[PDB]
Amino acid sequence: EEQMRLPSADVYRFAEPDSEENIIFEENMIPIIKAGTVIKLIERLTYHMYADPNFVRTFLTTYRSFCKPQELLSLIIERFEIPEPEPTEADRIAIENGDQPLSAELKRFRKEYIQPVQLRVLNVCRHWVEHHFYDFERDAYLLQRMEEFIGTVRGKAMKKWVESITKIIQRKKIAHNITFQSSPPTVEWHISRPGHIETFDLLTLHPIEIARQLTLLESDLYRAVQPSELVGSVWTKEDKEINSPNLLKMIRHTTNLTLWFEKCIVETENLEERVAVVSRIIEILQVFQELNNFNGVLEVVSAMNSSPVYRLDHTFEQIPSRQKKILEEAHELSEDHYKKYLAKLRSINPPCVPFFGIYLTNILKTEEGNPEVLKRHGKELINFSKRRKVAEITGEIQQYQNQPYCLRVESDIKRFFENLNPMGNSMEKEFTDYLFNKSLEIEPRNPKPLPRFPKKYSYPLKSPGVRPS
Ligand SMILES: COc1cc2nc(C)nc(N[C@H](C)c3cc(N)cc(C(F)(F)F)c3)c2cc1O[C@H]1CCOC1
Numbered sequence: 001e002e003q004m005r006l007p008s009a010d011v012y013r014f015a016e017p018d019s020e021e022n023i024i025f026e027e028n029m030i031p032i033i034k035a036g037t038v039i040k041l042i043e044r045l046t047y048h049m050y051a052d053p054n055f056v057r058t059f060l061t062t063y064r065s066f067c068k069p070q071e072l073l074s075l076i077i078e079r080f081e082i083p084e085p086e087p088t089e090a091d092r093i094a095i096e097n098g099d100q101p102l103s104a105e106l107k108r109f110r111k112e113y114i115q116p117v118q119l120r121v122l123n124v125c126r127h128w129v130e131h132h133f134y135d136f137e138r139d140a141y142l143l144q145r146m147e148e149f150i151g152t153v154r155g156k157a158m159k160k161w162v163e164s165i166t167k168i169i170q171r172k173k174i175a176h177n178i179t180f181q182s183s184p185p186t187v188e189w190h191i192s193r194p195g196h197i198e199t200f201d202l203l204t205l206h207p208i209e210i211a212r213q214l215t216l217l218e219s220d221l222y223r224a225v226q227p228s229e230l231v232g233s234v235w236t237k238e239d240k241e242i243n244s245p246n247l248l249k250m251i252r253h254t255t256n257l258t259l260w261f262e263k264c265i266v267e268t269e270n271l272e273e274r275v276a277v278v279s280r281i282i283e284i285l286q287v288f289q290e291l292n293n294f295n296g297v298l299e300v301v302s303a304m305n306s307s308p309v310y311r312l313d314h315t316f317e318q319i320p321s322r323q324k325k326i327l328e329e330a331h332e333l334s335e336d337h338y339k340k341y342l343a344k345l346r347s348i349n350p351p352c353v354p355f356f357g358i359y360l361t362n363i364l365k366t367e368e369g370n371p372e373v374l375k376r377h378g379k380e381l382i383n384f385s386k387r388r389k390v391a392e393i394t395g396e397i398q399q400y401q402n403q404p405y406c407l408r409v410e411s412d413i414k415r416f417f418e419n420l421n422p423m424g425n426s427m428e429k430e431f432t433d434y435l436f437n438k439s440l441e442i443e444p445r446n447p448k449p450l451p452r453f454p455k456k457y458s459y460p461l462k463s464p465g466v467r468p469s
Contacts, residue, residue, distance in 0.1 A: 004109050007083040014043045014079055021379045030055075032388075035374040035381035038067050042075045046120035048113045056127050061394065062387035064243050065232025069135040069142050077149055080121045082114050115157075122161035125150065129165055133172040134226060138242055143169070184408040185468055188212075191459045200416045202264045203280055203457065206464055211287030211296065213413040214257070216405060218295050218353050221250045223401045225356075227394035231387065234364050250356055254299055259422040259431065261303035265312070266438040269453035274442065275318040276461035278304075282323045285330060286466050291405070292352035294333075294345060301330050308435035312443050314450060350403035362393050 006015040016022065016039070023036040023044070030052060033044060044052070045059050063072055084106060087095065094101040125146065129136065136143040147169070150162045188206035192199040202210070229247040237244075237251050261281050268274040281300055288296035303309060304327055316324070333341040338358050345354055366389045374381040423431045444450065 001108075004113055005085045005088075005105055006109070006113070007085050011083045013039055020376045022381065024374065024376070024381060026385065034385045035383050037379075037381060038071075038075065041382065041384060042072075042079055046076070046079055046117055046124055048116040048120075051120070051123075056124060057131075058388055058391045060124070060127055060132055061227045061391050062231045064228060065387060066382045069139060070145075073142060073145050073149070076121050076124060080118055080149075082117060085109060118158065119161070122150075122153070122158060122165070126161060126165050126168065129168045129172065132226075132228065133168075136169075136172070178404055180404070180406050182406045184406050187408055187410050188464070188469060190464050195412060197412045197416065200413070202277060203461065204459060205413060205416075207280055207283040207466060208287050208464075208468065209410065209413060210417075211284045211291060211293070212405075212407050213410055214284075214296055214417055215288065215291045215293040215353060216407055216409055217414060217417055218253065218293060219351065219405055221246070221253055222295065222353055222356055225250055225397065227391065227397060230359065230363055230394050230397075231390050232367075234360060234367060237360070251360075254295070254356065255428065256420045256422060257417070258299045258303045258306075259428070259435075260420050261300060262306050262308055262432075262435055263422040265303075265315075266308045266435050266442060268456065269442045270455050271314060271318070271442075271453070273455060273457055273461060274312070274315050276463070278312075278315055279319060279323060280463055282319070282327055283463055283466050286326060289326075289330075290466075292348050292350075294341065294355040295353045295357075297330055298333065298341075298355045298357065301327070301334065305331065306432065306435070308432070308439035311439055314443055350400070351405040352400060352403070354397070354400045359393060359397055363390050366390055366393060 006012065009016045018040070023040040024034045026032040026034045030050065033041065033055070036044070041059065045055060067075075087101070087103075087106075091101040091103060091106075129146070136146065146165075150165050153159065153162050187194075188209040190204060190206040190209075192201070192204040224246040226246065229244045233241060233244045233247065237247065240248060264277050265274060265281070268277045281303070285297055285300040288294075288300065333344070338355070341355060341358070345352070367386065370386045370389070371383050372386070373383055426434065442451075442453065
């Protein structure tokens with residue numbers, strides 16, 4: 001007798017029937033949700049007929065783009081507190097008479113509807129604290145509410161779920177063990193002597209160590225980005241937003257490093273010195289490549305491709321062809337929508353730092369022109385399919401967040417790279433305009449004579465090379 005009698009929607013909001021006004025499924029693609037109201041999404045999230053692990057994962061990764069953590073907690077609590085449908089007139093008559101009605105439909109509602117749903121709400125809670133504990137770290141009150149809620153749950157079966165959720169919450173509160181599979185190589189130094197932080201610069205630190213420390217820094221920044229940080233947040237990447245601290249830190253780093261390489265190049269007006277700077281940056285790229293740090297490789301490429309750097313024909317004329325080949329092949333990684341890059345990424349062995357920029361590009365492509373909502377019969381439905389497509393892209397990022405580099409952190413170098421601010425107080429566009437004008441100054445366009453500039457560095461320009469000592 002499949003369909004059951006449910007409480008009315010005036011006492012239980014999840015009891016409203018499915019219609020085109022509140023839920024749409026995909027066809028020619030378990031029914032896959034294309035769109036729906038938040039109420040309908042939450043109902044299907046904790047659906048009585050079957051388990052939906054894929055929808056639970058996707059919803060919990062993407063829900064902040066259409067619903068607040070606090071609102072979500074209210075809705076699942078609401079979903080949990082199921083009223084019983086009022087007795088039928090026939091059942092109520094048996095009660096008048098002092099009799100006990102069979103209550104077949106009531107027993108069945110408890111069994112096939114109340115228990116599967118309450119259980120699925122608890123599974124959602126468990127998945128929530130395990131994979132998205134950061135929601136609770138950012139909002140202490142959210143965690144108070146969750147703890148208070150699970151503490152009111154009664155029943156033996158259910159109490160195993162409450163125990164699991166409690167266990168997780170404790171493990172997450174307690175929680176950085178670092179495991180070297182092999183013995184890390186000796187830290188490399190060049191002109192700047194260890195601890196002499198005031199002299200730290202592009203040419204004074206060892207090319208090898210710059211590349212190792214930037215790889216460690218970028219590996220940590222990449223590993224700290226949660227999938228959910230990339231959902232409904234792509235056009236405000238640079239803004240300090242509560243759902244995206246690690247996304248912001250990663251992008252800031254990439255921007256600062258790329259603009260720093262550029263600055264180091266165009267602010268070195270002496271040709272011989274500028275050639276040494278460019279050559280050193282290609283050396284850092286070589287070491288990035290041997291470290292499988294594709295994020296670093298592509299940061300060097302973006303810098304070498306920027307309008308201020310790309311036009312420096314006299315600088316690049318003095319670069320060894322072996323170095324030019326390296327940079328030329330590094331550019332080819334990005335051609336045909338990163339075709340060669342994806343081939344290398346998928347063929348190399350870990351520790352690696354995947355190029356992060358590509359995920360932002362693809363998420364932007366997926367979200368561009370993709371409606372936030374669908375409108376049916378004047379009502380609004382959340383476009384869940386848009387959220388699902390972003391989640392498929394973010395799922396890829398996770399697979400390369402599990403191997404530590406066998407490399408020793410150098411605290412002073414690390415701090416130097418963490419504190420890079422090439423822009424000063426300038427905005428990016430204006431700074432790049434300034435860099436472009438500096439490019440014109442150091443290498444005037446054809447009619448104009450090539451001026452010769454004073455040296456700004458008094459230390460050897462010769463590189464120690466990319467081979468360990
Ligand atoms: C059709 O566009 C492009 C084709 C390119 N093809 C290749 C083989 N490499 C490129 N760049 C590498 C990173 C490079 C840069 C510099 N500065 C010097 C070298 C070299 F080693 F050769 F000297 C190599 C290219 C950049 C392109 O376009 C960019 C610049 C304008 O806007 C977008």
